[PDB]
Symmetry: C2
Subunit: 91 residues, 2 copies
């Protein structure tokens, strides 16, 4: 009974990370006040007060500089990658 929390995976979109966030450290990162009627808001997924567990960032059409900056930014933290590779043999 009592406390129940839903874990949601939002639909990947462009410009949804332009939100404002709060907290940090061991507290966690939470979404602060939603800017008015922006694309990030109008997607029914993201809401004020939500705790962000993780961000999945897609490298599609990425500027090299921005890739470097992103990686540099996430270096000290916990990160997993989704990669495409070519070799044998896993049969």
């Amino acid at each position: 009974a009592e406390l129940v929390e839903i874990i949601v995976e939002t639909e990947a979109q462009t410009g949804v990370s332009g939100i404002n966030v709060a907290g940090g450290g061991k507290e966690g990162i939470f979404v602060r006040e939603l800017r008015e009627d922006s694309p990030a808001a109008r997607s029914l997924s993201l809401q004020e007060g939500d705790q962000l567990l993780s961000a999945r960032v897609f490298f599609e059409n990425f500027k090299y500089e921005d890739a470097l900056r992103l990686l540099q930014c996430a270096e000290p933290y916990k990160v997993s990658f989704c990669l495409k590779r070519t070799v044998p043999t896993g049969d």
Copy 2:
């Protein structure tokens, strides 16, 4: 002998640096050089020439300004969040 393509999601690891990349844009991002002795080369999760489709960054113990810099950096691109929300029961 026969070459094939695989998509891999690496095991989440904390503090992986030493990843050097090349390319961008319509081409995409590729792993070029794994820095010697870096936690990246000791991770073995990554190989050179591999394309990075996406990076999943965890907000566990994240310092505020770093999270800011991250989201600022990712604004022009495609992003999905994994979030936790409370409900009425529900």
